[PDB]
């Protein structure tokens, strides 16, 4: 099973499960630990921002790869936005400082 | 061709600044603003940048000096 881009999950703008929805591979938490133990910070960042969750980032990355400019504009993953709106949906005010 | 990066790591060190300087230089080649400094051997710009680092032709100091001088000559 392989995948470059495909359908994305509804609430969290992330790829889907395995090979029946043509979905991606889960780069779970332990894989993140392995990347952290290496120095691979751009690998990790692209793995969890442009390859998974950044809605605007992944389209820009697709376009940039199409014209041979292997650079990314990482951006903020959508799942963190969901978390912020969910903590705010409780009576808790969570915001980003120094806007 | 490229198998290991031990001469480039030697010449720059820290095993992390090598990645950053090689990425800067490979992007310089990839965008039509620079040309290789070593005979291209059908390599990708990442490997070409590493091979330039090994030769000593590229450093973080060389790159910023060249950027500065390009800025200065842009005035003309």
């Amino acid at each position: 099973h392989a995948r470059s881009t495909g359908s994305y999950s509804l609430v969290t703008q992330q790829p889907l499960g395995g090979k029946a929805q043509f979905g991606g591979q889960r780069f779970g938490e332990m894989e993140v630990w392995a990347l952290e133990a290496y120095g691979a910070a751009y690998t990790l960042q692209e793995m969890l921002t442009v390859k998974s969750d950044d809605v605007n980032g992944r389209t820009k990355m697709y376009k940039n790869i199409v014209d041979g400019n292997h650079q990314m504009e990482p951006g903020m993953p959508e799942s963190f936005n969901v978390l912020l709106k969910e903590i705010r949906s409780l009576g808790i005010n969570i915001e980003l400082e120094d806007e | 061709a490229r198998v290991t990066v031990q001469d480039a790591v030697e010449k720059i060190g820290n095993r992390f600044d090598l990645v950053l300087v090689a990425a800067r230089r490979a992007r310089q080649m990839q965008v039509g603003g620079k040309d290789p400094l070593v005979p291209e051997e059908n390599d990708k710009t990442t490997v070409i940048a590493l091979r330039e680092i090994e030769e000593g032709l590229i450093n973080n100091q060389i790159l910023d000096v060249r950027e500065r001088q390009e800025q200065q000559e842009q005035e003309a």
Binding site: E36, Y38, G39, A41 | F16, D17, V19
Partner: peptide, 18 residues
């Protein structure tokens, strides 16, 4: 702030403490 991003983070501090 660990690996190849450590430098980046340091640079951010260079701009934050000004």
């Amino acid at each position: 702030p660990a690996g190849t991003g450590y430098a980046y983070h340091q640079d951010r501090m260079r701009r934050r403490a000004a």
